[PDB]
Design an enzyme around this catalytic site. Structure first.
Site, PDB file in Angstrom:
ATOM      1  N   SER A 227      -8.126  29.017  -2.655  1.00  0.00           N
ATOM      2  CA  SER A 227      -8.855  30.506  -2.999  1.00  0.00           C
ATOM      3  C   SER A 227      -8.283  31.499  -3.997  1.00  0.00           C
ATOM      4  O   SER A 227      -7.096  31.583  -3.910  1.00  0.00           O
ATOM      5  CB  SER A 227      -9.083  31.248  -1.528  1.00  0.00           C
ATOM      6  OG  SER A 227      -7.727  31.324  -0.724  1.00  0.00           O
TER       7      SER A 227
ATOM      8  N   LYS B 224       0.635  18.443  -5.549  1.00  0.00           N
ATOM      9  CA  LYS B 224       0.526  19.152  -6.744  1.00  0.00           C
ATOM     10  C   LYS B 224       1.833  18.982  -7.820  1.00  0.00           C
ATOM     11  O   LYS B 224       1.453  18.588  -8.862  1.00  0.00           O
ATOM     12  CB  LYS B 224       0.282  20.680  -6.538  1.00  0.00           C
ATOM     13  CG  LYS B 224      -1.067  20.852  -5.487  1.00  0.00           C
ATOM     14  CD  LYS B 224      -1.303  22.277  -5.214  1.00  0.00           C
ATOM     15  CE  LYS B 224      -2.485  22.465  -4.661  1.00  0.00           C
ATOM     16  NZ  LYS B 224      -2.762  23.483  -3.701  1.00  0.00           N
TER      17      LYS B 224
END
EC number: 3.4.21.-
Lengths: 194, 195, 195, 195, 195, 195
Positions: free
Chosen positions: C90, C133
């Protein structure tokens, strides 16, 4: 997740089928507020079912009693989460809740109900009626309203019949009469069914 | 970790949810509000519809008891983290609490998780997965859990686990706020409007 | 490689995502800004609602701290690479930083990947899949990776990967700008506005 | 035969794509622009969302270096033929070129194939399947193929083949136009804007 | 059976499409127009987008050559039967021709199938599956088949199937009309407006 | 049962459709009309586009033949039973006949099924799956099935469905009304408006 006794505005104990073969009690609440274009607000697994039902019953919500649904926001929840649950089309429990919320007339919680409301106000048969009655028994509900055309589909095993009252109905007016709390507001809503 | 376990934060609430059909998870929410120049509720990812429904339901209760009209605000909502397979609750009360907190500018207690559906009348409706939620609260090191009063009989915790958490039943959104909002004049003031 | 790993580029940032369950990717973001001929965010694909969210939040930060209001402007956000099964962060700070770079005309260090969600007040919030990541930024030849400060305890870097990359924990969007924007007189003009 | 191999046509470009697993194919596109009468992008078929994303991306440059806001036009795009099992380029340069061609009224050289992704900044970005795509352009009797500068080393033109086609590497959209737009005063002045 | 093979009908055209990877099918269309009361295109089912696109492309030519404004009409298109797994052609000419037929009130010859894509300029563009569409025409007892001029070289018909159908290459929509519209004063009138 | 096989009922028509692979079903339609307390057609689910299409085409013929205007009323259309896999027919005549019935207050024979597409001029158009539909009328104990007369040569009944049901082929909507409306004053009054 649901109440078995007492009356509550905009609250109904519907019945549905969880996966392949048990019924469950499906409690709904409906509330209504001024639109301030009126929407139907519902979330979760059964949200399209709810929105569809409110769209189907909209003429009977006005074209008997009083308000146009396009001038309200209609706020619906199922109380709980029901993945793997199939609810009735045009479910009568959702209609009753919404009419209950609008009229501000409380609904008897001890009476469960299953059925599809036709756009002409008929109560149409539904699947799973025996499973569903059995779930109403296991929940402590006193009575179950069902479609008149489902009378023959109820195959309870001696003991269980007797445990609950099965009220078969044809018409949405019969459902309201059986569940709306008695009083002047009901007497007046009831006369409008013509 | 995705949540905070102690202290007070404006517009931030520790929610609870279920992943799979087995495990609970803490569901942290942040709500932020900005003037609009009409308002909109901005939220993304799989639980945004739960966000929008909760704001719709708390708007009504906010204007009724206070006068603040949040159609004048953009309401900005995030779930902190990403929540796939996660099923939230209808009109979730933790979302609604976050919004009231952001609007009133009163900090929320991060040691208290909460789960509940918010009716537009402001009642706290029951929810599924109560035990699995409270457990995930316990694992997270949270001190208390707010649950709907109607869920009291769904709490099935081992002895040892009753011990490790406080479970506080509520039926109305003003009890939730009494329990989580930081003590002060602003809180005192908000609490008398909601009576 | 459609995606760069050294140099300075205006409006381009290496983001990080998690694909399916677990594998991470580098996810480059290209932003371009053009006086609207009011204004709007133009993005395509599944991640469009995220880009409009990041843009909204960066706009509130830009307005506040710089006086520059980007609502007279068209913000084009693009994701490099055809990915599928990607859930984004988000209000992703990658997008927010590509847009500040694009607006300010101040190039971005391509050897730094980042991850994080941006609040409207400008805090960098924690995010999922941080270990994956980072392994993907290691994988991709990148020299630095910026992560949220609150994700520190979730770096499960081991005896292979404890050595391969500078991990930079950040609290706020000014710390991101400090570690990625090209040094010089424009960066300095800008960074003393968040002070 | 679905495409034209020689001569010039307004709004008509020979793109290249990959059909299923291995093979390249020529992907002829036509674009046509009419007065909007809010502007839409109209495409049907398998590749209709890739067509729309690509005009939406590009509008950046279609606007920004040159002529008109595409919100004032309806953009009608077809692929000439049916393209089952075809993956076209994202942000396709041919689509961008077809669109600029149709708005400017400048015809495109049909003997030049092209492949690559346009950045919202005007850069030509590397694409997949370049050997395969080149080899479809050779099989089709096309004379030249524009590819991404970053794909130069992905060109493995065997013995055979070298010599049958010119491979023109490009970094930027203005280079693409220069190579395929018909010479004349209209081209001359369009190229000065692209500076 | 779903189409008509003989005689002439207002608003009805025999189109041709492909089913699955290869097979051809007759695709009968009917178009009907009513006064609007701005206009819409009503078409349902799997092929509706091709109907909308075809009408969009013929509107401009209708007003261009004829003055009538499709803005002022509701255009009601049905494909006669159900066409699961069928891919039609982009901006299909059979649909355009139906609309022109409906609007002019001049009957279309049902012995003549057609296939082709319509450009907004009124060019007929090539299409895929031309051998298979023609085979489908032959097998239906259709006398003639109109195809695009650039598909001449895709007609792969053996001696015995040649002789069974007349193939008529076109490159513009007025050639279509000239070939399928019933002879008479109205048609003479219309053909002159297309000059 | 999720249909009824006898009686006369206002506004209710036994349609026919086909699901997945080959099988057919009885698909009852209920129609309800009320002056718009402009009007709307309100329908739900996957077949809603068909309902509004059926409505629009019957509208045009009702207004032109009986001076009535479906535009001054809200028309509710509803499908009885719950179906994935179902394909409807465009402008389906069962929806159109339920509507005319609801509007004129004249009961529909419940022993009849029908399948067919309606044109705006009131013709009954052929349809897919004619045999499978007739057999789904047989399974359901229905006495008559109305088909498009152009579907006469699509009836391929085998030895256990030959001679079980009365197949009635029709070319126009009034033949439909003649075979399903209950006889009396109102039916006679209405039938001469159409003859």
């Amino acid at each position: 997740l649901f109440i078995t006794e007492g009356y509550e505005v905009g609250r109904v104990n519907g019945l549905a089928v969880i996966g392949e073969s048990a019924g469950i009690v499906l409690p709904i609440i409906a509330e209504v507020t001024p639109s301030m274009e009126g929407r139907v607000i519902a979330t979760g697994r059964l949200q399209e079912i709810a929105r569809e039902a409110v769209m189907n019953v909209s003429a009977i919500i006005k074209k008997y009693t009083g308000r146009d649904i396009s001038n309200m926001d209609v706020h619906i929840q199922f109380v709980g989460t029901y993945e793997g649950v199939e609810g009735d089309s045009a479910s009568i429990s959702i209609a009753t809740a919404v009419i209950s919320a609008i009229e501000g007339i409380p609904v008897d919680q001890s009476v469960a109900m299953t059925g599809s409301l036709s756009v002409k106000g008929e109560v149409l048969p539904v699947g799973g009626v025996t499973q569903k009655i059995e779930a109403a028994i296991q929940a402590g509900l006193k009575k179950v309203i069902i479609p008149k055309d489902n009378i023959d589909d109820v195959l309870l095993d001696a003991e269980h019949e007797g445990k609950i009252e099965v009220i078969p109905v044809s018409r949405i007016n019969e459902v309201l009469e059986h569940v709306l709390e008695d009083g002047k507001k009901k007497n007046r809503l009831m006369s409008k069914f013509k």
